[PDB]
Amino acid sequence: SGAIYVGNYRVVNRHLATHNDWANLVWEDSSRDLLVSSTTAQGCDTIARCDCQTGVYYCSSRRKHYPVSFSKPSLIFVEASEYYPARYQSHLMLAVGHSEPGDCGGILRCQHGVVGIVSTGGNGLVGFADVRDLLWLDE
Numbered sequence: 001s002g003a004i005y006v007g008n009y010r011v012v013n014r015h016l017a018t019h020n021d022w023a024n025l026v027w028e029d030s031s032r033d034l035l036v037s038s039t040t041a042q043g044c045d046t047i048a049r050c051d052c053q054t055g056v057y058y059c060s061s062r063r064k065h066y067p068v069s070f071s072k073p074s075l076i077f078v079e080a081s082e083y084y085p086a087r088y089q090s091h092l093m094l095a096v097g098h099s100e101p102g103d104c105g106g107i108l109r110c111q112h113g114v115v116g117i118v119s120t121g122g123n124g125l126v127g128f129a130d131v132r133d134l135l136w137l138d139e
């Protein structure tokens with residue numbers, strides 16, 4: 001579990017979104033596993049605007065932060081789940097690191113701020129849904 005709070009927005013994994021997220025829906029993309037809902041309170045999260053390939057992510061299954069090298073956002077095939085059929089997930093970045101179901105929502109950060117959130121994983125690989133291109137989060 002986990003979300004990004006920037007300005008009047010809440011950024012969560014689409015497959016973990018609540019009824020309130022859908023009642024106050026701003027944008028969603030099933031192909032990215034992203035959903036953005038509106039909030040009343042202000043958000044204090046700086047979103048990175050960069051091409052960084054190194055960062056730090058929070059892994060709640062270990063209650064630890066791990067430094068990682070990660071790939072550029074791309075189309076990667078993701079196996080079937082109770083939320084999605086077998087499809088290519090866009091804007092996804094992989095890293096070598098620990099992840100298990102329950103880690104989705106862990107923020108990935110670089111020196112510039114929030115890069116993305118855990119979305120996939122398995123076999124020593126962790127996948128992150130990129131958010132740096134959503135310039136409308138900051139404006």
Ligand SMILES: COc1ccc2c(n1)[C@@H](C(=O)N1CCC[C@H](C(N)=O)C1)CC2
Pocket residue numbers: 015033078081083084089099100101102103104118119120121122
């Ligand atoms: C987060 O780490 C892991 C590790 C192992 C495993 C997972 N997640 C789970 C996972 O990746 N997905 C299920 C929920 C939706 C996901 C998506 N973005 O399409 C895919 C399946 C096993």
Ligand SMILES: [Zn+2]
Pocket residue numbers: 047048049050051052110111112113114115
């Ligand atoms: Zn950055």
